[PDB]
């Protein structure tokens, strides 16, 4: 769908948008042809970027983005350093004030099926989950979201911004219905 290309290279900082192809291509993945899967990896990784600004200076760790050694860095260091239990996978940040990883969720589907899912996917306690929708909803473990509702409302109206560009585009109907 070349314009939903067209609207990723429009949308998203040059940063976000380079990051994405050389995510998508690792894993054989053309952004040219999977455009709806192109903006999907650029949305996460800008609420990902949005979040780790969302509270005090340096209170997060951005691990999503950064290549595998140095992710895996990131992570084994921080586990060394505070005695936190080494997840599985990598997840999209660390909270230095609550001393947990975060796993983001950006959903065109309903927030509720995505939590489980990341739920079940992730199997280890500590970890939190934050979940957002194109929609507003947004949802967290213990109902535990963070950051202050200023900086999840930048987050849900750019969201929201999205969604609106790629309606105004026909483009939305479309990548609402790719989603896993
Ligand atoms: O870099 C990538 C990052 C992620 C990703 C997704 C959710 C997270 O929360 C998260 O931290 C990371 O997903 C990717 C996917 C897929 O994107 C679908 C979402 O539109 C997911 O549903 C799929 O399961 C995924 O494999 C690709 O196809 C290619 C990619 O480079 C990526
Ligand atoms: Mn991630
Ligand atoms: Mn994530």
Same mark, same amino acid.
Request: cysteine-free; hydrophobic content about 5%; proline content about 0%.
């Given at each position: 769908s070349g314009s939903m290309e067209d609207f990723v290279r429009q949308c998203f900082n040059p940063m976000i948008v380079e990051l994405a192809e050389k995510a998508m291509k690792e894993y054989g993945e053309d952004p040219k042809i999977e455009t709806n899967k192109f903006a999907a990896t650029c949305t996460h990784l800008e609420v990902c970027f949005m979040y780790s600004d &969302?509270?005090?200076?340096? %209170?997060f760790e951005i691990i999503? &983005? %950064?290549d595998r050694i140095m992710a895996w860095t990131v992570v084994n260091s921080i586990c060394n350093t505070t005695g936190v239990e080494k997840p599985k996978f990598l997840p999209d940040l660390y909270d230095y004030k609550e001393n947990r990883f975060i796993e983001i969720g950006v959903t065109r589907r309903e927030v509720h099926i995505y939590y489980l899912e990341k739920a079940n996917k992730i199997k280890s306690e500590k970890t939190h989950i934050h979940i957002f929708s194109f929609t507003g909803e947004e949802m967290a473990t213990k109902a *535990?979201?963070?950051? *202050?509702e200023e900086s999840r409302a930048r987050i849900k109206t750019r969201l929201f911004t999205i969604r609106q560009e790629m309606a105004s585009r026909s483009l939305w109907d479309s990548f609402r219905q790719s989603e896993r």
């Open positions: &969302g509270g005090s200076k340096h %209170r999503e &983005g %950064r *535990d979201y963070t950051l *202050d």
